[PDB]
């Protein structure tokens, strides 16, 4: 079967991280949308203009809003992308056929929206050469960050080719986790985000979203289907594109 | 010998078009800078804010200005990049060891700054699915354009892989030739832009900067050294990276 995949990137990144997966998925007959979230990729906004994960999630929300009644899509988020998914699912669940998590965070409904973000910081406390800053928005102080080049090379693009790593050093922009804001945000609902089929995809070779964390996430919130890719790194859509596409196909054939 | 290469991209593009060449050049021991010109790549400005090719060229100019006395670089421009080179050469020639033109426009000093741009439009009049618009800046009406996806696929990324073409559809932004502005701009000087060693690199397989035009350019303004790559397409830094790097090395060994 054919499906409409909406590929959601993580912070400090853009749609470009899907430059390989997108064409391959279409080569399978699928409709693929790769969105740029606020102040990400070639989006004209700057991070200082964003005041929350919800605002940051704007593009995805508007994309969904524009879908004609009856059309369902499959959201695919990577790393911090799972949060964008939960935010949208609580506003457009009828439109989501399923949601795939690609080495991503898996929020739940029993805890605050920052729960898994906080846990990640516990397992991966040292972001190496990453630098931070602070700006103010809507009376809240936000911690902005720009991913360190060494961190990218060693923990994110570990097994990626130099030509791919190069793109990261030329395209990654200032971003934010909006962690303190998430802490005060309303819990994701069980009726919306809770009702959607969730497929968790990961590799125990991820140098940042370490096994302890990802395994911790599966036990905390039991996914509907778990797929464990063998090998690769954090960026499986680059190091294991073919495999990922194989799974997405299986998902398209299972959920609609 | 080792050199500091400053890779200049063409309009509607960004530094990302050098994501392959850059790392390879360093693998050779060279210092490589890949700049994002105004409203290009992840530059925060929008084209409507730019009013001329000179403003558009800002980043390059500032990069040169920041070089400490005695440091020389080799400018490498592609396609419309040659214009950015002439603009800088008339302001920092002492700092330029040489300038390589990569399937680029070759401005001269006997004609107006738009001369070769106008000639290109004669040889390549149909930009297919490219769309245009107009905005006003400093009392001048400027014709903006966004490169058509078919044009990119068929004439620019002809032999490039789908994964590379994908990047273009996700990264190319609104741009402009500033052609009408160039027409009224002062002629490039013979003392500055004229004095610099110019190396012209091209392939007769370029589907947009056709042979008739490129050959026309070499006869019009005799380059110091001509290199004809066999095969590939317009984007030789993607289709013939290794070769290009071989030439750049030879250039670094010849000019300083």
Curated annotation (Swiss-Prot), chains A, B:
Residues noted as binding (S)-mandelonitrile in the record, renumbered to the chain: 10, 79
Record text on subunit structure and interactions: Homodimer or homotetramer.
Organism: Hevea brasiliensis
pH profile: Optimum pH is between 5.3 and 5.7.
Gene name as annotated: HNL
Protein's name according to its UniProt entry: (S)-hydroxynitrile lyase
Family to which the UniProt record says this protein belongs: Belongs to the AB hydrolase superfamily. Hydroxynitrile lyase family.
Result for mutant: residue 79 to A: Loss of catalytic activity
Annotated SUPFAM superfamilies: alpha/beta-Hydrolases
């Amino acid at each position: 079967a054919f499906a409409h995949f909406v590929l959601i990137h993580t912070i400090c990144h853009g749609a470009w991280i899907w430059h390989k997966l997108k064409p391959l998925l279409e080569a399978l007959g699928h409709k693929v949308t790769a969105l740029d979230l606020a102040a990400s990729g070639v989006d004209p906004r700057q991070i200082e203009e964003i005041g929350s994960f919800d605002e940051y999630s704007e593009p995805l929300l508007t994309f969904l809003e524009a879908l004609p009644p009856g059309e369902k899509v499959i959201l695919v988020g990577e790393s911090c992308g799972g949060l964008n998914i939960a935010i949208a699912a609580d506003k457009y669940c009828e439109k989501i056929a399923a949601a795939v998590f690609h080495n991503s965070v898996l929020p739940d409904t029993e805890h605050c929206p920052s729960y898994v973000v906080d846990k990640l910081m516990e397992v991966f406390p040292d972001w190496k050469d990453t630098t931070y800053f602070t700006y103010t928005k809507d009376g809240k102080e936000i911690t902005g960050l720009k991913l360190g080049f060494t961190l990218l090379r060693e923990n994110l693009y570990t097994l990626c080719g130099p030509e791919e790593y190069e793109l990261a050093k030329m395209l990654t922009r200032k971003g934010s986790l909006f962690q303190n804001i998430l802490a005060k945000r309303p819990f994701f609902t069980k009726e919306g985000y809770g009702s959607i089929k969730k497929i968790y995809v990961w590799t125990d070779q991820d140098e940042i979203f370490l096994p302890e964390f990802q395994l911790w996430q599966i036990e905390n919130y039991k996914p509907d289907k778990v797929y464990k890719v063998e090998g690769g790194d954090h960026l499986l859509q680059l190091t294991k594109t073919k495999e990922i596409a194989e799974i997405l196909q299986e998902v398209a054939d299972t959920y609609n």
